[PDB]
């Protein structure tokens, strides 16, 4: 007898990913600072998205010329969040970009793909304790632009932690 190796006809491209043990990687739970959503915890998803939009991009490591990290401090001083940035309308973004942020026309062009897709600012769990993984799925208006998948339901700021509790913040 010669048993055939069980394969599939249609396989998603996520299953083509590499693991050194050819197994499922560990998903370590996030640190105890993310247990309560506070002002120290609110803008860590906004910081990593602006960090990735300014760093090197691709296999050839194309450096993004516009530095969007300089606008992180003035965004958190106004008290606006990445999840609160997706709730702003079109007229509220022209007021935010021109008056407060003073975003130039090329810095506005590098940030707009992150706002056009409505990226869910949820810290994904990873193999390490310090996670720099944000869920890049497109959000829907029924689930608060959180993409509604893997437990990101309308208030979830961090994967594995509690909701937003908007009465406090």
């Amino acid at each position: 007898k010669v048993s055939k190796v069980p394969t599939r006809s249609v396989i998603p491209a996520d299953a083509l990913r590499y693991h050194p043990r050819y197994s499922v990687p560990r998903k370590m739970v996030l640190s105890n600072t993310f247990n309560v959503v506070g002002e120290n915890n609110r803008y860590t998803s906004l910081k990593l998205i602006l960090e990735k939009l300014s760093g090197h991009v691709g296999r050839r490591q194309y450096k993004m010329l516009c530095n969007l990290e300089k606008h992180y401090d003035k965004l958190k001083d106004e008290g606006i969040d990445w999840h609160e940035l997706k709730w702003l309308s079109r007229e509220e973004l022209i007021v935010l970009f021109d008056k407060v942020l003073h975003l130039t026309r090329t810095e506005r062009a590098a940030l707009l793909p992150a706002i056009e897709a409505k990226v869910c600012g949820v810290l994904r769990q990873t193999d390490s304790r310090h996670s720099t993984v944000v869920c890049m799925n497109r959000g829907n208006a029924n689930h608060g632009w959180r993409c509604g998948r893997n437990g990101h339901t309308n208030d979830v700021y961090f994967e594995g932690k509690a909701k937003a509790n908007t009465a406090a913040l």
């Binding site: 437990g151 594995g160 932690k161 509690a162």
Partner: protein, 50 residues
């Protein structure tokens, strides 16, 4: 199958709950499976790990 049962609560989405440790160790069958030997029943509604 080979199942594991913990004493403390660890939910499927987040760890917050309204139970104590004594509450959940009576809920999640930890006292049960600690005092139960082979041949007896174990609930399917209790979550099993690994």
């Amino acid at each position: 199958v080979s199942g594991r049962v913990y004493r403390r609560f660890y939910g499927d989405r987040n760890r917050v709950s309204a139970h104590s440790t004594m509450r959940w160790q009576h809920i999640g069958g930890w006292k049960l499976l600690k005092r139960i030997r082979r041949g007896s029943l174990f609930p399917h509604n209790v979550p099993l790990y690994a």
